[PDB]
């Protein structure tokens, strides 16, 4: 017995595929090994996404894995809900419940607002980018209306990097004359690097400037640049380099080669690859459970076409979904347990503060409890 | 001749289809005819939208008319840009550049900001509905940062229709706490109607307050239940009922046998229906210019499917776009001229106020010239 | 042993006839049965009233139930007092003392004056209607002269359904001129509803005002519109929904259907229909008491003619009157007991306020004890 | 040329019947005669009024003359407007439009308010009775709210005679609370006489106190009982004993004995009798106009009864209305012209002021022209 799945990846994501492959070989059960059919593409292009989805569907697949973007999420969820097909993804959670989706990335509004309240903040600048949804923006606006914060929201994605050098100085002079020292960067890792580059270029990271990063990849980017800048820099992390699971994994990982396993001859891993590992873990766990419950959801014939009207659902997929969301596992990202919808719950996020010696875990946040300090 | 096209109407757009039929019968002639294949659907279901698009593309149409929403726009844009088939629509404009799309609804951010500057506001509230987009919210936030305002933003989209009575009351109570007299509603017609009902109920339409309907359909809502409260009320209009063309159209529209043409026996008309009328007009003019240019625009049953891998378009489509964006004509919305990206230009927006003796066009706004008073 | 009676109802009073039947079946048989002959008619047309009265007196009835108006009351009073035929009615009591008339409606003047003294008013407005008499107006004017008040009286009855909005708006504007915030409506359900709609339209139900509905139908009106405006709204009630008999009756009453029992599938009930039910109870009790006293009230022959000269009144009629003015029971309206003139006594009027949570009683008013607080 | 009519008179009306006979004489056209069937009754008893009406309608009458009060007017209006039967009366007009009713008495609100203004009044009192309608009271309160008056209204018709000494005493003492020196008396003849008697008893008839008689007969009561005292006293006069016609009539009125013509040997005549005279005159004139228009209105004791179901009128009746509301003569009351409703149009009232010498005509009030000076 062997289950066939479909994988969707962007054009330029080597480390995530490396993690997927190493997880496949590690967790490979001689009882049943998985056969993934891979499709690389431009995740933003919804046409290519739909073409790939239809191709995987015509191949008779029970579950799909891959990333989605802001311009490719609604079609994904709609297809999954209409065909009752399972889509696993470490990408940003959806702006609301969406059945038949497995979110391996935890929310961030909670821990972020907790950190804010903890540092006793009342005024700051939220520099955001429309890449992972705008739920955090709406969340902070609501919490500002609640606690009466004088927050200033500013988008940066529409600004061309070419012309985004003079407007930068303009807005920074505005912040200086307004004394907007506190900032929150809800942007992508690459954009975060670009912005810290511009900052080091202007040197506006003097004492008082308390920078916060609204992402889980704190140690992923470059922080040795602002290490000794005397600037309050904070962030979150989801993978703990302290536990033994992560330690043995990173051993076996950095002990690899960048020839057949790109982006794997180092230590600093990206939370995306860790969530891919955990997703392979949960997938094999759910398939083992389905095989042990005496349930054979194996389709006799091909699932057929996607655009074929009317919709052609099937209950074995509903059982698959109920199986994925009936799981409780450990991985590089900590504890893993989903609710009835598909989100991830019972998790912990390690808060980190940048210092001269380097980053230090200054506490942890969870859902049952608020932010904790150690 | 006889040229066929498609229509992607929602389930609940009757006035729009009525105006579509009206334009079809009026602008029609013997030079050729327009054959629309219509589809009434759930416009948020990206799966259904994709099915309808692929269908109308298999039939070999030359263009498409219809609608979309935040949960269906990227699919349409990518499909049209990959297949080079055009797509006309009165729905909200795309937050960016997108080819093979003709957007009939002009932008609103500019006129809104000009009006706010005219009234010289510094601290106010903004009630938005996530279900329609947030570009305007982001624009106003940027302008506030650049102008030191106090914008209290609030989402009213997640509010179901089962208990949306105490929610608004608590909301406006909280606003009264913050001493919020000035408000801006960026919502559809039904939502603004409900909000106004609750305002009246809590008696918040009296002198001292202000309201601004961030929509081109000012006189389309039941603006009479508040015309006598005593509160400032401003808004925007795109159809000028004091023009010759609008009156000559109403002469035939108010006598249309509503049973036959739903939502027709009246003198009011939603701006979506007017933009649909203008859309029929512009596509007719474009195909007429094209047929009168000595170009072979013959297309046979050689399209087939939409998921063709590789996906090859037909190069004649690019011509239609070049001809659909080279139209400079007048209609219910006023002047109509498009740019290279499909957005509208050289347009006018009548800034209206509400007085006890009815609304009155206090001024006009444009993109080349800022707000103008009279 | 079926006892014949008559009934006079307007054209539009169906809830009242429904309650009449409910009562006829509740007290159906103690030692006998009843038999009503109904007549619907324009009650303000004294000609039809006279025709009905004469037709019923010809059928040899022992009593009569029905309504009247300001312009159909002297006819009833005279005919009854000359022919010795009782007349039970919930309509407005007479502007004086008249025999052979049982007025089931209590007087509202005393409680209204006590309430006005309680709120300590000195200058206010009184909106009256030429519908049920001006006795209240005369009483309040006299008490004003005796207490140095400033009453602004306005008639709102002699206006058609063609300029209502203009009339009410101009009226309340004239009020605003005098800075009048305290108002008293002596109108009925329809008029108060219209006035409330209009005052909401102009926004005068907000904090800083005070209204008093001078009718026992406080809850019977639609107050849900102004429950949240923030303005005082006082009123009177005669049926305590929080009682035992009222609760059992409303349980038995809301279960019925609007097909056989119009206006009998709700939780509320107008004081007119409640008084109708109580009147059925009164008539039953009186005739049963007569049967207990062993009185053969049978006619020796036919009643005769309604206009016979010399008009001869059958003596037994007098005794009937006594049995109607001697009974004391407990019903919806409360302690039902009459005096030697037909009026009501030992009654209780529950004063009510409209708080945001809903109409919550504050006290009660009696004839021996003035307004009580609670 | 022999017409039978009906007359309704109170039990105690002498001057009115005397004038009726004198008029039937002075207009006994040799062409045709008017045979009256007279009925003396208690006009405050709707039963007797209706019985008499039916008796006269049975004997085949074409027109009916008589009086009524606030307790018998709606009966008359309904019976007439239903059976299409004319009813002439000098009694108080009807508040509204009631067809088939000739109202020879002019209204009084106009001249009354015009006088109030001509004397520059701002605050005063108004003692009325409930026996002739509250129209004047309502008009006064309306024009007060419109002209910012401080008016103290009182009802003095609900009190007996023995309890007047104390009641009137306390009433006047309270009236002096606001130091009232200007009062209006909209009462009957006996009422005003008792009022002025109690006044002189209390001694408040001295200068400073201004009284007004709100009626047309400011010559009949004790014009001299309170004359001496220099106290401002005013009044109205519909008749003018100086005119030639009135003098030629009074010359015979006085000479005429009292036995066969009770209440006749005098020089002053209660306005009711003058209007009775004018009524006979106009009825003769109308029947003459009809007999001249070559019209047959043959009617007799065949029309049937009053309570017939369904009450059917007869066409030839309506014409008589057009024959009474479309005539014009010059009698005691002056120019007589009616409208489509039945009331007068172009009457000329005279004003009178009392001095130690006697009454003196001040000016005259009309409908088109307001008060006038001589
Ligand atoms: C940057 O990081 C340093 C790390 O220690 C922060 O230092 C201490 O942090 C607290 C809170 O994070 C600061 O204080 C608060 O103190 C003010 C009084 O100044 C009080 O009103 C507030 O209620 C709150 O308790 C404190 O000033 C700061 N420094 C010291 C010497 O304790 C620092 O706050 C972080 N932010 C910046 C802008 O440096
Ligand atoms: C509703 O609209 C009326 C329009 O009359 C607004 O009255 C407006 O009143 C304000 C008062 O602050 C005026 O502002 C002023 O101009 C004078 C003279 O330059 C200046 O000295 C003041 O400091 C203030 O800036 C405003 O001009 C006037 N409207 C217009 C069109 O001129 C009323 O405020 C509006 N209601 C609300 C709630 O906004
Ligand atoms: C409305 O109701 C409030 C609360 O009952 C009234 O406020 C009272 O008004 C009197 C004046 O008559 C004040 O002395 C009191 O302090 C007020 N509060 C209380 C708790 O008694 C108010 O007057 C009423 N009328 C209006 C127009 O608001
Ligand atoms: C009573 O009548 C007299 C004259 O007949 C009125 O008198 C003068 O009238 C002018 C007109 O406004 C007033 O300004 C004077 O005050 C009047 N003089 C006096 C001595 O009163 C008078 O106004 C009338 N009213 C009263 C109450 O006497
Ligand atoms: C805008 O449109 C109007 C109407 O067609 C036209 O007259 C005007 O020239 C246009 N503006 C420009 C800049 O072309």
């Amino acid at each position: 017995n062997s289950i066939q799945i479909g994988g969707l990846f962007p054009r330029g994501a080597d480390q995530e595929y490396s993690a997927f492959r190493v997880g496949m070989v590690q967790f490979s059960t001689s009882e049943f090994r998985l056969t993934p059919h891979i499709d690389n593409l431009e995740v933003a292009n919804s046409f290519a996404v739909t073409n790939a989805f239809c191709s995987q569907f015509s191949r008779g697949v029970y579950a799909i894995f891959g990333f989605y973007d802001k311009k490719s999420v609604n079609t994904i969820t709609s297809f999954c809900g209409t065909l009752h097909v399972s889509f696993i993804t470490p990408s940003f959670p959806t702006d609301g419940t969406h059945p038949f989706v497995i979110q391996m990335r935890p929310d961030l509004k909670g821990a972020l607002l907790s950190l804010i309240e903890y540092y006793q903040w009342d005024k700051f600048a939220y520099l955001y980018d429309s890449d992972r949804g705008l739920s955090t923006l709406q969340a902070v606006l609501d919490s500002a209306a609640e606690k009466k914060w004088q927050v200033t929201a500013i988008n940066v994605g529409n600004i061309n990097n070419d012309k985004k050098d003079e407007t930068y100085r303009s807005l920074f002079q505005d912040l200086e004359l307004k004394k907007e020292r506190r900032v929150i960067l809800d942007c992508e890792r690459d954009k975060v690097n670009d912005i810290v580059d511009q900052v080091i270029t202007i040197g506006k990271h003097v004492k008082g400037y308390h920078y916060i990063i609204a992402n889980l990849g704190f140690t992923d980017g470059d922080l040795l640049k602002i290490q000794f800048g005397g600037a309050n820099v904070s962030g979150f992390q989801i993978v703990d380099y302290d536990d033994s699971l992560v330690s043995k994994f990173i051993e076996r990982w950095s002990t690899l080669e960048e020839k057949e396993y790109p982006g794997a001859h180092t230590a600093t891993i990206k939370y995306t690859s860790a969530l891919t590992y955990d997703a392979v873990q949960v997938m094999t766990e759910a398939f083992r459970n389905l095989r042990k419950q005496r349930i054979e959801i194996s389709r006799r014939g091909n699932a057929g076409d996607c655009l074929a009207n009317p919709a052609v659902p099937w209950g074995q997929g509903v059982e698959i979904e109920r199986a994925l969301k009936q799981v409780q596992v450990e991985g590089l990202s900590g504890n893993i347990k989903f609710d009835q919808n598909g989100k991830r719950i019972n998790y912990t996020i390690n808060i980190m503060e940048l210092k001269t010696n380097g980053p230090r875990k200054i506490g942890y946040w969870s859902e049952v409890d608020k932010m904790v300090v150690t």
Side-chain angles (χ1 to χ4, degrees), chain A residues 298 301-315 317-321 323-325 327-339 341-352 354-359 362-366:
Chain A
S298 299
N302 72 322
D305 293 339
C306 58
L307 305 171
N309 172 272
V312 290
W314 50 301
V318 187
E319 170 51 27
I320 291 277
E321 194 191 7
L324 276 301
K325 308 175 176 176
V327 178
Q328 204 181 26
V329 179
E330 184 65 10
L332 317 191
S333 74
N335 194 28
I336 286 161
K337 182 180 78 202
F338 311 103
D339 63 56
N341 291 12
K343 310 282 181 184
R344 168 160 162 173
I345 52 177
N346 193 1
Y347 56 99
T348 188
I349 297 168
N350 308 89
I351 302 89
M352 317 304 296
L354 184 77
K355 294 149 180 172
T356 67
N357 53 310
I362 68 174
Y364 71 91
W365 190 91
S366 171

Side-chain angles (χ1 to χ4, degrees), chain A residues 175 177 181-187 189-196 198-203 205-206 208-250 253-257 261-284 286-289 293 295 298 301-315 317-321 323-325 327-328:
Chain A
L175 299 160
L177 54 90
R181 306 271 148 161
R182 279 79 181 281
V183 310
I184 312 190
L185 317 184
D186 193 73
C187 305
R189 192 168 63 94
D190 292 358
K191 206 74 167 293
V192 167
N193 282 9
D194 186 357
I195 295 306
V196 297
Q198 298 298 345
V199 159
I200 303 152
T201 300
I202 203 67
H205 69 73
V206 306
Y209 278 68
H210 196 176
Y211 279 71
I212 296 178
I213 317 301
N215 80 345
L216 322 175
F218 187 47
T219 66
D220 294 348
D222 56 325
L223 302 189
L224 290 73
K225 288 55 169 168
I226 320 309
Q227 210 160 278
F228 310 90
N232 282 28
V233 160
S234 307
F236 316 77
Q237 277 272 66
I238 197 174
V239 64
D240 194 329
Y241 284 114
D242 195 328
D243 67 65
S244 297
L245 304 90
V246 174
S247 76
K248 174 262 158 189
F249 157 75
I250 188 172
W253 178 261
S254 192
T255 46
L256 297 204
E257 51 280 7
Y261 291 66
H265 205 205
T266 176
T268 306
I269 199 170
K270 320 197 300 190
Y271 60 111
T272 66
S273 294
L275 295 170
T276 303
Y277 206 65
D278 302 5
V280 178
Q281 178 60 36
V282 77
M283 284 147 73
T284 186
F287 286 129
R288 170 182 311 106
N289 308 326
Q293 293 165 14
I295 307 163
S298 299
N302 72 322
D305 293 339
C306 58
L307 305 171
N309 172 272
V312 290
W314 50 301
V318 187
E319 170 51 27
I320 291 277
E321 194 191 7
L324 276 301
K325 308 175 176 176
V327 178
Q328 204 181 26

Side-chain angles (χ1 to χ4, degrees), chain A residues 9-10 12-13 15-22 65 67 90 189 253 262-263 270-274 276-277:
Chain A
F9 293 92
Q15 184 172 9
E16 293 82 355
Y17 190 57
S18 301
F20 185 77
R21 195 170 65 247
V22 306
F65 171 86
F67 305 175
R189 192 168 63 94
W253 178 261
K270 320 197 300 190
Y271 60 111
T272 66
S273 294
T276 303
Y277 206 65

Side-chain angles (χ1 to χ4, degrees), chain A residues 125-129 152-156 171 175 183-187:
Chain A
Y126 189 67
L127 279 287
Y128 74 115
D129 167 65
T152 83
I154 309 186
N155 185 0
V156 301
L171 58 77
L175 299 160
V183 310
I184 312 190
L185 317 184
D186 193 73
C187 305

Side-chain angles (χ1 to χ4, degrees), chain A residues 43-51 71-73 75-76:
Chain A
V43 62
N45 183 291
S46 190
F47 178 69
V49 168
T50 315
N51 165 25
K71 304 182 184 184
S72 61
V73 52
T75 191
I76 286 283

Side-chain angles (χ1 to χ4, degrees), chain A residues 104-106 108 110-130 132-145 147 149-159:
Chain A
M104 296 282 288
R105 189 186 294 195
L108 208 64
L112 182 54
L113 302 158
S114 181
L115 190 85
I116 277 172
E117 287 277 10
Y118 170 89
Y119 289 151
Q120 308 95 13
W121 280 27
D122 56 330
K123 156 166 176 174
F124 49 90
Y126 189 67
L127 279 287
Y128 74 115
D129 167 65
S130 46
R132 301 90 55 71
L134 273 44
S135 56
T136 57
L137 170 52
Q138 304 171 196
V140 300
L141 296 158
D142 305 327
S143 287
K147 325 305 170 45
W149 296 338
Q150 310 93 1
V151 54
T152 83
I154 309 186
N155 185 0
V156 301
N158 56 18
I159 311 190

